[PDB]
Amino acid sequence: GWKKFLWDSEKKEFLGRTGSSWFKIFLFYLIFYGCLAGIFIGTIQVLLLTLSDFEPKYQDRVAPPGLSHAPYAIKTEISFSISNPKSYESFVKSMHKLMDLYNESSQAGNSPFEDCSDTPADYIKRGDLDDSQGQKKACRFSRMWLKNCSGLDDTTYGYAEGKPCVVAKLNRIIGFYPKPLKNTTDLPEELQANYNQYVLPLRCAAKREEDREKIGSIEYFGLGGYAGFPLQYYPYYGKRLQKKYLQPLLAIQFTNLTQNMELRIECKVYGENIDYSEKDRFRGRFEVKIEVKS
Amino acid sequence: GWKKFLWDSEKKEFLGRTGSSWFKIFLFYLIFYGCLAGIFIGTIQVLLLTLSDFEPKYQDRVAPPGLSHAPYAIKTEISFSISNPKSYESFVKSMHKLMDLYNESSQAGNSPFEDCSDTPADYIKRGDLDDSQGQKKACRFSRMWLKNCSGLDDTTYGYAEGKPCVVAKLNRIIGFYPKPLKNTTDLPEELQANYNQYVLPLRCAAKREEDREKIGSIEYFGLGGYAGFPLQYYPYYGKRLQKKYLQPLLAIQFTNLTQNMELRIECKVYGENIDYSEKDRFRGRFEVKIEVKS
Amino acid sequence: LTSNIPEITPFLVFIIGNVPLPLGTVTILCIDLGTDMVPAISLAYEQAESDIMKRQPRNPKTDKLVNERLISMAYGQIGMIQALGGFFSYFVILAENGFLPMDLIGKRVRWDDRWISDVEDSFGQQWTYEQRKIVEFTCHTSFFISIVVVQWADLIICKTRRNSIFQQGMKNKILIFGLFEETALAAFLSYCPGTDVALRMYPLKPSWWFCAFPYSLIIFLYDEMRRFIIRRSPGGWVEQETYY
Amino acid sequence: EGPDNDERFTYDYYRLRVVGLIVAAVLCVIGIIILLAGKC
Amino acid sequence: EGPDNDERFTYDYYRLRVVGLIVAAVLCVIGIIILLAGKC
Amino acid sequence: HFIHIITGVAVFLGVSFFILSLILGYSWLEAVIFLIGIIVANVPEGLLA
Ligand SMILES: *[C@@H]1O[C@H](CO[C@@H]2O[C@@H](C)[C@@H](O)[C@@H](O)[C@@H]2O)[C@@H](O[C@@H]2O[C@H](CO)[C@@H](O[C@@H]3O[C@H](CO[C@H]4O[C@H](CO)[C@@H](O)[C@H](O)[C@@H]4O)[C@@H](O)[C@H](O[C@H]4O[C@H](CO)[C@@H](O)[C@H](O)[C@@H]4O)[C@@H]3O)[C@H](O)[C@H]2NC(C)=O)[C@H](O)[C@H]1NC(C)=O
Numbered sequence: 022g023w024k025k026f027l028w029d030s031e032k033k034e035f036l037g038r039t040g041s042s043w044f045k046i047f048l049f050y051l052i053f054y055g056c057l058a059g060i061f062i063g064t065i066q067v068l069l070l071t072l073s074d075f076e077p078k079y080q081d082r083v084a085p086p087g088l089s090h091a092p093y094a095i096k097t098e099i100s101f102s103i104s105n106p107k108s109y110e111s112f113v114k115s116m117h118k119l120m121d122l123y124n125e126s127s128q129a130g131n132s133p134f135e136d137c138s139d140t141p142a143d144y145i146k147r148g149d150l151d152d153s154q155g156q157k158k159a160c161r162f163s164r165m166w167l168k169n170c171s172g173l174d175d176t177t178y179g180y181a182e183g184k185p186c187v188v189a190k191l192n193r194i195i196g197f198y199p200k201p202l203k204n205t206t207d208l209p210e211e212l213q214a215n216y217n218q219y220v221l222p223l224r225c226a227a228k229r230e231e232d233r234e235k236i237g238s239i240e241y242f243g244l245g246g247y248a249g250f251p252l253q254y255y256p257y258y259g260k261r262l263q264k265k266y267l268q269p270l271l272a273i274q275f276t277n278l279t280q281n282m283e284l285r286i287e288c289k290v291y292g293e294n295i296d297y298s299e300k301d302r303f304r305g306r307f308e309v310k311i312e313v314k315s
Numbered sequence: 316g317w318k319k320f321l322w323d324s325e326k327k328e329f330l331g332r333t334g335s336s337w338f339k340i341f342l343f344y345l346i347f348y349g350c351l352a353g354i355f356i357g358t359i360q361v362l363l364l365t366l367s368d369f370e371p372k373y374q375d376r377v378a379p380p381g382l383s384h385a386p387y388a389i390k391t392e393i394s395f396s397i398s399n400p401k402s403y404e405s406f407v408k409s410m411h412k413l414m415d416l417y418n419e420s421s422q423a424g425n426s427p428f429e430d431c432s433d434t435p436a437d438y439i440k441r442g443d444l445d446d447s448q449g450q451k452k453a454c455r456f457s458r459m460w461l462k463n464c465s466g467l468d469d470t471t472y473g474y475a476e477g478k479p480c481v482v483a484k485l486n487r488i489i490g491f492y493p494k495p496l497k498n499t500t501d502l503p504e505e506l507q508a509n510y511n512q513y514v515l516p517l518r519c520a521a522k523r524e525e526d527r528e529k530i531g532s533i534e535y536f537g538l539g540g541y542a543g544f545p546l547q548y549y550p551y552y553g554k555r556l557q558k559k560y561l562q563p564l565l566a567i568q569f570t571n572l573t574q575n576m577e578l579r580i581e582c583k584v585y586g587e588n589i590d591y592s593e594k595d596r597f598r599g600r601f602e603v604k605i606e607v608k609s
Numbered sequence: 610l611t612s613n614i615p616e617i618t619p620f621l622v623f624i625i626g627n628v629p630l631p632l633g634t635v636t637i638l639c640i641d642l643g644t645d646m647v648p649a650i651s652l653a654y655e656q657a658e659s660d661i662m663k664r665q666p667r668n669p670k671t672d673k674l675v676n677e678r679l680i681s682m683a684y685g686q687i688g689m690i691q692a693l694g695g696f697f698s699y700f701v702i703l704a705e706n707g708f709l710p711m712d713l714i715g716k717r718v719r720w721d722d723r724w725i726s727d728v729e730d731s732f733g734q735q736w737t738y739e740q741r742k743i744v745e746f747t748c749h750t751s752f753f754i755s756i757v758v759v760q761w762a763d764l765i766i767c768k769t770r771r772n773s774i775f776q777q778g779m780k781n782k783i784l785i786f787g788l789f790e791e792t793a794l795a796a797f798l799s800y801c802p803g804t805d806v807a808l809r810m811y812p813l814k815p816s817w818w819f820c821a822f823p824y825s826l827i828i829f830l831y832d833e834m835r836r837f838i839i840r841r842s843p844g845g846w847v848e849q850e851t852y853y
Numbered sequence: 854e855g856p857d858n859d860e861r862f863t864y865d866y867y868r869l870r871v872v873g874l875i876v877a878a879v880l881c882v883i884g885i886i887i888l889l890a891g892k893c
Numbered sequence: 894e895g896p897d898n899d900e901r902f903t904y905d906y907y908r909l910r911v912v913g914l915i916v917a918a919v920l921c922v923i924g925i926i927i928l929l930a931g932k933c
Numbered sequence: 934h935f936i937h938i939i940t941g942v943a944v945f946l947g948v949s950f951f952i953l954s955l956i957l958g959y960s961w962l963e964a965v966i967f968l969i970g971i972i973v974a975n976v977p978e979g980l981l982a
Pocket residue numbers: 411415416418420421466467470
């Protein structure tokens with residue numbers, strides 16, 4: 022048994038078959054698997070021919086847009102000590118990674134960054150989604166616009182003395198036009214003042230009624246000094262048609278933050294084609310847990 | 316026009332295209348036609364796998380059987396002069412071609428020719444239509460059985476002195492059992508005498524009522540002296556299972572034939588699974604025009 | 610212009626390869642003036658694909674009505690497949706009755722003779738003259754039916770020159786009626802009593818009618834992928850080589 | 854398969870023609886239906 | 894295609910679910926029919 | 934123009950199967966009859982109507 026089924030010397034068999042059998046079977050599986058591979062490849066090439074290069078066929082799974090943030094906090098918590106410097110390093114490295122893409126050196130020349138209104142403005146249509154007029158042009162977004170959170174003056178961005186910043190960003194969607202709420206009698210309390218039609222408002226608050234008092238002065242920095250996103254940076258034409266495109270950003274400084282206590286801060290954007298979801302806690306709004314323990 | 320569309324020297328074109336175009340088109344048609352050929356071949360191989368080697372799937376177009384004859388007469392007319400020898404050569408060459416297959420030298424040994432009853436007998440079943448018992452065995456048919464038309468005594472077979480012979484033959488069909496008419500009160504006039512159940516009768520006559528008198532003595536030669544086919548040579552197992560198989564034959568001498576006049580002679584076989592057709596003049600019966608002009 | 614190929618190739622094989630005659634004269638005439646007319650007269654009712662009032666006026670010296678790009682399709686690619694399907698059904702009919710493909714090459718001289726009442730087939734049987742002729746005529750009938758089957762996919766791939774079928778749509782009621790009538794006429798010409806007497810078309814067994822289906826599907830898939838690279842790739846090889 | 858194997862050489866072309874005609878007829882009708890469906 | 898191109902981000906999943914259920918139901922019925930056809 | 938095109942391939946296929954029928958053996962009566970058959974066979978009866 023043990024020895025024979027391994028090698029017998031009368032029938033010159035190994036493991037059970039002879040030399041010619043292993044060859045017939047190996048050749049059969051090589052041809053079979055080769056045909057399988059060729060068929061799968063052909064059915065994938067017809068797929069490359071079906072879709073378009075400038076536009077995803079289905080855009081229903083990404084609407085309305087989300088709201089992401091830097092830094093990169095795990096479990097949506099930003100906890101760091103004001104004394105130990107090796108506590109907020111993982112945060113600064115991220116913040117820096119995000120802002121490092123808005124360097125002025127990158128935005129230079131006429132293309133593909135054209136100078137746009139220093140004050141919020143309306144939409145700008147650079148034609149259709151075609152290759153006729155080549156690479157489109159995107160508006161320039163300067164770092165300095167963000168006042169106290171730019172890494173140009175205080176590299177740390179605030180984490181050094183108990184005053185952190187949070188750079189909020191709206192998820193890029195192809196052909197998405199942001200629509201802000203109108204001046205009619207129905208509008209949230211907050212939004213009434215400084216209604217600039219051309220700005221999509223972003224406003225943070227406290228999740229619970231108690232935490233209100235423990236949260237200090239939320240100071241928003243942005244284009245034109247408003248707490249929102251200028252409509253002029255839309256719509257987005259996609260990577261293929263608009264490489265070297267920069268999306269607006271909004272800085273938020275949480276000055277006067279109570280020490281040694283977990284604070285739940287919920288930020289929320291407002292607008293017509295903006296809708297929240299009780300399941301996705303990043304659709305339109307976002308939550309952050311801040312605790313400057315020192 | 317005439318000259319340019321043939322060869323211009325600025326674009327280096329011949330007949331209209333350049334060197335690389337003829338290659339792109341030739342390569343495309345080579346690949347296209349190659350795929351076409353491979354597909355047709357595959358669909359023909361599956362067909363070789365569908366059918367059986369020992370039996371045609373459909374046997375409805377050949378039933379009942381026909382009745383062919385030697386010689387090979389064109390328009391069913393046998394006209395020859397008793398003086399000019401170069402008149403009946405085309406006939407003798409055929410008659411000889413047919414009888415040349417019953418030479419005793421060919422039929423020798425135990426296989427695959429076994430000795431069968433010298434007198435008509437019943438059917439013989441050599442098993443089914445399989446390859447289990449190898450090549451089947453067929454009964455021997457001697458030349459000499461045909462008395463005055465054998466080419467062994469009078470090579471010409473009769474055409475030399477105004478007395479011709481006609482070797483009739485039943486079309487070979489796989490698995491076909493000949494069934495003669497029974498002795499009941501309903502039977503043609505002719506068939507009554509010499510009812511040998513084991514013999515399929517063949518009887519010739521005149522197409523028109525007038526010609527009767529002008530036709531002499533129809534002398535049939537066959538197995539056992541009867542004017543028919545012995546049932547023992549059936550059934551036929553097909554070429555693949557019965558190579559070297561000989562079908563019975565019946566000789567007919569038209570003695571006492573009126574000179575210098577066209578005679579229409581119709582020969583007919585009788586039997587249960589035998590049916591004639593008003594469209595096919597060779598199904599079961601046959602017509603011959605004889606005119607021994609001298 | 611596509612059905613001319615599966616109509617001339619059989620005689621070319623009759624004279625060259627020396628096989629019995631695949632397609633008859635009374636079948637070519639029934640196709641050219643029967644089946645083909647209604648589906649082709651219905652093609653006229655087809656709607657536009659793009660805005661015709663946008664393109665510039667056609668050029669008289671360069672853009673023609675019938676160019677070589679059409680001949681390359683009808684005479685070169687689709688008609689060829691139609692010929693393969695017809696010959697396939699042919700060989701099937703002759704193989705099921707006893708005449709295998711190896712024994713058909715070189716038989717015409719004896720297959721036609723009116724006085725040879727003993728023609729041996731691949732199995733050893735002896736066929737009279739009228740008996741083998743009946744089979745040849747049944748082969749003409751199935752060849753004609755194979756032509757109709759391939760014309761289905763040809764009428765569908767001819768409906769749109771560039772666009773896809775899943776885009777334009779089968780909103781043309783005349784074309785649908787053409788397909789239905791085209792099939793009813795073939796069945797009528799084969800199954801009606803006294804047709805094998807008047808026109809020489811014998812009934813078919815139900816398993817034969819399915820010998821042309823794969824070729825038709827293939828024609829449909831080939832033209833579908835053809836009308837795809839033209840859309841995604843404007844100005845390429847497929848365009849200057851196959852766009853009518 | 855024995856002398857009385859006569860069925861091995863028969864085919865019911867009659868029934869086949871009957872069915873083939875019923876089918877041709879149905880297809881013809883359906884065609885007419887589609888053609889006139891809309892003008893009523 | 895203009896600001897009011899809102900349709901480009903909507904899909905009628907409701908109607909799709911309704912039809913998919915009608916179809917599932919029909920298939921289930923047909924199955925039962927085939928299963929009990931013969932025991933009556 | 935369409936008629937021109939059609940008649941071109943019909944006479945091309947006929948001259949080619951004539952030279953072919955001479956390389957294989959057929960007599961001149963058959964080669965000539967074959968030529969006439971191929972040309973007429975390449976004519977579409979209903980495209981004009
Ligand atoms: C089947 O059997 C056939 C007959 O067999 C003969 O008879 C049987 C019973 C046995 O005795 C057997 O041994 C006999 O041979 C057989 O065909 C025969 O084949 C031989 C050999 O070729 C032929 O002999 C030659 O004959 C010619 C002249 O033939 C005249 O008559 C015939 C009709 O019989 C006409 O068709 C011809 O046109 C002629 O009018 C001679 O010229 C020839 O000469 C050759 O031989 C001599 C020596 O004898 C030499 O000096 C010469 O140089 C030549 O080489 C032969 O003598 C014989 O004619 C022929 N019979 C018939 C009826 O055709 C046949 O082949 C067998 N087939 C098979 C498959 O077994």
